[PDB]
Design an enzyme around this catalytic site. Structure first.
Site, PDB file in Angstrom:
ATOM      1  N   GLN A  74       0.800  -1.208   0.000  1.00 14.18           N
ATOM      2  CA  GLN A  74       0.000   0.000   0.000  1.00 14.18           C
ATOM      3  C   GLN A  74       0.850   1.283   0.000  1.00 14.18           C
ATOM      4  O   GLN A  74       0.532   2.241  -0.715  1.00 14.18           O
ATOM      5  CB  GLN A  74      -0.980  -0.014   1.162  1.00 14.18           C
ATOM      6  N   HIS A 103       4.333 -19.664  -7.550  1.00 17.54           N
ATOM      7  CA  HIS A 103       5.265 -18.915  -6.695  1.00 17.54           C
ATOM      8  C   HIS A 103       6.622 -18.723  -7.370  1.00 17.54           C
ATOM      9  O   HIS A 103       7.188 -19.658  -7.938  1.00 17.54           O
ATOM     10  CB  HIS A 103       5.458 -19.565  -5.320  1.00 17.54           C
ATOM     11  N   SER A 112       3.365 -23.832  -5.956  1.00 24.46           N
ATOM     12  CA  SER A 112       4.824 -23.769  -5.982  1.00 24.46           C
ATOM     13  C   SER A 112       5.366 -24.168  -7.352  1.00 24.46           C
ATOM     14  O   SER A 112       4.689 -24.863  -8.137  1.00 24.46           O
ATOM     15  CB  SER A 112       5.392 -24.807  -5.009  1.00 24.46           C
ATOM     16  N   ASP A 132      22.426  -9.082 -16.684  1.00 26.90           N
ATOM     17  CA  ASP A 132      22.365 -10.283 -17.510  1.00 26.90           C
ATOM     18  C   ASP A 132      22.425 -11.592 -16.703  1.00 26.90           C
ATOM     19  O   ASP A 132      23.120 -11.677 -15.697  1.00 26.90           O
ATOM     20  CB  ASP A 132      23.426 -10.213 -18.585  1.00 26.90           C
TER      21      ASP A 132
HETATM   22 MG   LIG Z   1      23.906 -10.611 -13.794  1.00 18.24          MG
HETATM   23 ZN   LIG Z   2       3.371 -16.336  -1.283  1.00 14.24          ZN
END
Ligand SMILES: [Mg+2]
Ligand SMILES: [Zn+2]
Ligand SMILES: CCCCCCCCCCCCCCCC(=O)O
Length: 630
Positions: A68, A204, A250, A566
């Site tokens: 928030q 996740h 997951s 990178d």
């Molecule tokens: Mg890097």
């Molecule tokens: Zn979470």
């Protein structure tokens, strides 16, 4: 004619403090940043109706969440610089839920606990970079077409709380506990070449574990980088990988040949990123349905405290939300927790114990004084983009919690010509987890972080349905309540930089470890320099390192071939003695690198104890040769 929309794509650096700040997501007092694997970005997508318009902006960020405090400050900044253009109604901020960025950018104590409080430099970089991404996007507006598609991605995710998921009576199409749906909004230019894309898919972003100390945008960040850097051909491509309802999802185990799953978190990050990328690219390539029609939106701050819930959304009785509580490493330390009270003493009020239902309360966060540890006023938002509706929800919704809301909104919006509803969790604020009534009763991890009690999901469903009906009927949503400003009164117990000194007998930028004479493709180059603390300067839109190509030989004009952003490079910082430090930089030389001569340059910043002045420092290695072929 001509083209139905204009769009603008922009990207800007939101990377925070790269050493000695607790990371956000794993709640660990022993997971402080120690360098950068890849940077964190805000990717902004401005869309305007040519008819109209009527502009919307959607920003996806490489962060654990968008708190928030960030939302409020970003909106104020936009209103200050671009009056009348942007406000809460037409700006959506969402996060990828990477667990590998620096924390301390909430104003709610719960989310700053392991970080030891508020980290202003990281907060400010996030706000500033989100605003810069929108500025860049709006300066690149161009006519174009929008396409939508969807497909099923099977092997990228797994349900981590399957026992609770199976308590739902309504799981047809989700019997494996997975939401396999990926949706893609593609942005096609006047050529029609693909200019950018947003992919929504729940998983996740936790491939980099709590053992890792390098900043990383994790598997969704790798998907974006692979598309932008390795795949498009076109500049400047922007690819966002956004979340849907990922609360109980997951990454799948990585059982690709020759790998243990476990063996290498970088390999896992790359693999799960690639699985998402491959599906997004496939869907975009199909250009399944052109998006046509109006842009619209609604937004409301909702006070969750004693929010009434209508019987249509509950068991059939009127209900009311509970104030926030968490159900069943500080230790130890934790001076911030101690400044808050810290944990205990309950028993909590009887009314709270009773309406939290099957939860066994560990922490009564809602009743903490002077400020609750968790939010109470939460943003609810919906964009209409032609026949699409995009919902921005301020929490982690489990598969069925999100699916039920999607279904309810699609039913309410069908008459308005809506054909696809995309649920984007982790948007505009963060208020922990949302589980269905049935999941909540099981009290696995997601239950028990469902703050507002058993009817939290029902409340969100009511709020989104009511907003969808308002859109359908035209008509305003109810007046916003007033998001508390906690900016005055943030605590912090994380120490900063006292000062830097070079290694005894050396100067800042001196090379500690030179590269070998020569390397082959596939080899890792590791070098190291005397440095200063990265907290001194985030090097926003710049870099701590460059890999520089100087030709076959000669003697050729230097060209940078890699930066700290990178995948193939890493930057690691570590304290040496009391006030010195070293920067260790590596480059894994990828297939396709030109044979020739290269060197590595380091850029850093150092603080003087006496004057407190922060200065630029730097150094360059001797050249080395990459051997090979073409
Ligand atoms: Mg890097
Ligand atoms: Zn979470
Ligand atoms: C209970 C909901 C009705 C009350 C809403 C209060 C009316 C004031 C809101 C004015 C802001 C404009 C809202 C969007 C209206 C629209 O574009 O359709």
């Amino acid at each position: 004619d001509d083209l139905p929309y204009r769009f603008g794509l922009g990207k800007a650096d939101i990377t925070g403090e790269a050493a000695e700040v607790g990371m956000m997501g794993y709640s660990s007092l022993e997971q402080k940043t120690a360098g950068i694997h890849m940077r964190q970005w805000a990717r902004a997508f401005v869309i305007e109706e040519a008819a109209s318009g009527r502009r919307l902006v959607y920003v996806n960020t490489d962060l654990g969440m968008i708190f928030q405090a960030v939302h409020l400050k970003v909106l104020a900044r936009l209103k200050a610089k671009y009056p009348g253009v942007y406000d809460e109604n037409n700006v959506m901020l969402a996060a990828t839920h990477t667990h590998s960025g620096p924390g301390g950018f909430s104003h709610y104590a719960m989310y700053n606990l392991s970080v030891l409080g508020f980290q202003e430099k990281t907060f400010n970089a996030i706000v500033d970079g989100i605003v810069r991404s929108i500025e860049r996007a709006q300066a690149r507006l161009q006519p174009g077409r929008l396409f939508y598609g969807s497909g099923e991605l099977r092997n990228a995710s797994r349900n981590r709380s399957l026992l609770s998921h199976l308590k739902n009576p309504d799981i047809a199409g989700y019997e494996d506990g997975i939401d396999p749906q990926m949706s893609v909004l593609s942005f096609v230019d006047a050529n029609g070449e693909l200019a950018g894309a947003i992919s929504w898919f729940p998983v996740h972003s936790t491939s980099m574990t709590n053992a890792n100390h390098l900043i990383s945008p994790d598997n969704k960040g790798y998907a974006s980088y692979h598309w932008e850097h390795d795949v498009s051909r076109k500049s400047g491509f922007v690819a966002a990988f956004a979340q849907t309802n990922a609360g109980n999802l997951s990454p799948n185990l990585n059982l690709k040949p020759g790998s243990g799953p476990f063996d290498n978190e970088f390999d896992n990050t790359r693999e799960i990123g690639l699985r998402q990328f491959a599906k997004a690219y496939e869907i975009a390539g199909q250009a399944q349905e052109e998006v046509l029609g109006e842009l619209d939106s609604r937004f409301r701050f909702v006070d969750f405290t004693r929010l009434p819930i209508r019987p249509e959304f509950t068991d059939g009785q009127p209900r009311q939300l509970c104030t926030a509580a968490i159900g069943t490493l500080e230790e130890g330390n934790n001076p911030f927790l101690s400044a808050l009270g810290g944990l205990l003493t309950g028993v909590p009020p009887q009314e709270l114990v009773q309406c939290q239902a099957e939860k066994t309360i560990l922490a009564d966060t809602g009743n903490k004084k002077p400020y609750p540890w968790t939010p109470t006023v939460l943003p609810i938002q919906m964009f209409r983009i032609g026949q699409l509706e995009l919902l921005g929800a301020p929490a982690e919704f489990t598969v069925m919690a999100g699916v039920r809301i999607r279904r309810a909104v699609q039913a309410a919006s069908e008459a308005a010509g809506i054909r696809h509803v995309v649920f984007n969790g982790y948007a505009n604020a963060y208020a922990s987890y949302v589980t269905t009534r049935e999941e909540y009763a099981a009290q696995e991890y997601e239950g028990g972080s469902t703050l507002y009690g058993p009817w939290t999901q029902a409340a969100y469903q009511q709020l989104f349905v009511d907003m969808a009906v308002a859109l359908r009927e035209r008509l305003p949503v109810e007046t916003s309540a007033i998001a508390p400003d906690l900016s005055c009164c943030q605590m912090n117990f994380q120490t900063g930089v006292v000062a830097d000194d070079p290694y005894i007998g050396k100067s800042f930028g001196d090379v500690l470890q030179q590269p070998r004479e020569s390397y082959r493709i596939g080899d890792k180059v590791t070098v190291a320099f005397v440095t200063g603390h990265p907290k001194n300067d985030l090097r926003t839109e710049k870099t701590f390192l460059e890999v520089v190509n100087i030709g076959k030989d000669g003697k050729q004009t230097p060209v940078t071939v890699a930066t700290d952003n990178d995948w193939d490079t890493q930057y690691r910082w570590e304290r040496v003695g009391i006030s010195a430090s070293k920067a260790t930089i590596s480059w894994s030389i990828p297939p396709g690198t030109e044979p020739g001569h290269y060197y590595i340059r380091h850029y850093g910043n150092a603080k003087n104890f006496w004057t407190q002045k922060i200065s630029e420092i730097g150094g360059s290695t001797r050249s080395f040769e990459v051997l090979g072929t073409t």
